[model samples]
Target: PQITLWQRPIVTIKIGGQLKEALLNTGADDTVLEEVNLPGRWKPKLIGGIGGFVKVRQYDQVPIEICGHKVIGTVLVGPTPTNVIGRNLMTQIGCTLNF
Candidate 1:
């Protein structure tokens, strides 16, 4: 499916059985969550972006559902302003950016 980049395209997705809205970011390679309580062993990671680099918890094998489509992979959680749906998970849901 094609997604329009109109004002940080946001979509409702389910993570850890909880529903939350996230921004579809094609420019990003990893998905980032604001703060989600996940049960598992996570390693420390540093992510750099608009606000510089920030330490985050990198949890592997995390599953997130987007519009009924299930995507399992890594999800970064920390003090992020908005949840981001990067190319990693977006490709699973057949999301493509047509320019």
Candidate 2:
């Protein structure tokens, strides 16, 4: 699938049996969510970016699906402007820029 840089690339992602609309951000390094419904244990993390840093719950080996493709990796749950699908998750889904 192709995505243009002009608009926010939003898509449906399933996490812990729930569906959520997340933005695809190539600039991000790790996937982030707005909620903490993810099961298991998590370590406290201070995630920072364009808008500064925020407290987050960092989980490892979390399972999520994008376009039906399953991916297992680290996920950060925190207060963000929006749920983001970052480069780590993007690579799992085989996304790339053609330009």
Candidate 3:
């Protein structure tokens, strides 16, 4: 998908049978979501931001549908300000920034 930089690349995503909005953050390394109850086991992980590092749960092989494109990858759940679809999943969806 070719995306412009004028506005935030936010898209509707379907994950775990739930629909939600997320930002396509190419700058981010991994996908992170707001406090959502994801099924299966998750491992405790830490992610570093400008402020500091925060603890998050890493769920692997989670299926997510981004704007109708389906991909299975790792998803982190924690106290993120917003849901972000990072480069990990973005690469799978062939997202590109075109000016």
Candidate 4:
């Protein structure tokens, strides 16, 4: 309920089959994932741009628990670099970002 900086719940995603931790970024408008870590099955729908439309062969929604909260329908595969948590997913649950 209280908001702070420098501390927020994060989730680990397996990219390219490698697991990596990513911080939930509510400020971002789109979900992002590491390009190098993307799985082979997700190659068909690779979209372009940072804040633009994204294409993916399929959507892998995963259930995640963060800071005592749970979120479903969370996109598993996403764009690389600038991996973000975006408003679409963050809005589903109440979150306060610290930093």
Candidate 5:
């Protein structure tokens, strides 16, 4: 998909069987979701952002559907301002930045 950068790169996605909207943040390295009730075990991790570092739960092998494309990767659950679809999942969807 050819996405123009004029507006926010937000897209609808399905994570852990729940459908939600998230930003396709090209600048981010890891995917982060807010207040999601993901099943299974997770490890505590600290992630840094523009505001600083925040503690989050890291879940591996989590399945997600980005734009209807199924992919599995690590998803971070935390108090993020918005749900983000970072490079971890973007690469799976073959998303790239173009000029």
Candidate 6:
């Protein structure tokens, strides 16, 4: 059977040594971490693809929990103004839009 999932606005709260709140985006394919919010030990790296439009200082993988679903191998520590929530975390949870 095929399942069609609904996408909605979700609040993303990240807490560790620091705490942050962001609106989760379902349209994105990779979880992006903001440089300012990332932990010091995460060691952010630079990532670039397609015409070298670059995103500075990103972590390849990290751990995060969303909507009561635990997601591992998450992409942590990316640049700010990050609006997308990648499939790595989204696929693990069910999104429902209520009218």
Point to the candidate with the largest lDDT.
Answer: 5
**Can you write out model 4's per-residue Cα lDDT over 1-99, one digit (the tens) per residue?**
554545664665443445556667766654555554433344345456658856654344544444445664435354455555666567656654555
Candidate 3 local lDDT, 17-53, one digit each (tens):
7899999998999999985788998999989866888
When summed lDDT is taken over every stretch of 10 residues in candidate 4, the lowest stretch is 35-44
Question: Which candidate do you rate higher for lDDT, 3 or 4?
Answer: 3
lDDT of 5 by residue, 1-99 (tens): 787888998999998778899999989999999868899999999999558879999999999999888999899999888999999999988887776
Q: Quote model 4's TM-score.
A: 0.48
Output the TM-score of candidate 3: 0.90
Best by TM-score: 5
Q: How far is 36's C-alpha from truth in model 5 (Å)?
A: 1.1
* Residue-level error in angstroms, candidate 6, position 39: 6.4
Model 4, C-alpha of 54: deviation from truth (Å): 6.2
Q: What TM-score would every model get versus the actual structure?
A: 0.86, 0.88, 0.90, 0.48, 0.92, 0.54
Query: How many residue pairs clash in model 5?
Result: 0
What does candidate 1's lDDT look like per residue over 7-69, in tens digits?
Answer: 668888999768899988888898989868988899989988556789999999888898678
Candidate 4: pairs in clash = 4-98, 5-98, 5-99, 6-98, 15-37, 16-37, 33-79, 33-80, 35-80, 45-55
Ranked candidates, highest TM-score first? 5, 3, 2, 1, 6, 4
RMSD of each: 2.0, 1.8, 1.4, 5.3, 1.5, 5.6
* RMSD of candidate 5 to true structure, Å: 1.5
Candidate 4 deviant stretches above 4 angstroms: 1-3, 6-20, 35-61, 96-99
Tell how far residue 98 is off in model 4, in angstroms: 10
Full-model lDDT, candidate 6: 0.52
Candidate 3: worst-modelled 10 consecutive residues by lDDT: 90-99
lDDT of model 5 at position 45: 98
lDDT of 2 by residue, 37-74 (tens): 98899999887855876889999889999867898878
Q: Best to worst by lDDT, what's the order? A: 5, 3, 2, 1, 4, 6
Model 4 residue 60 lDDT score: 49
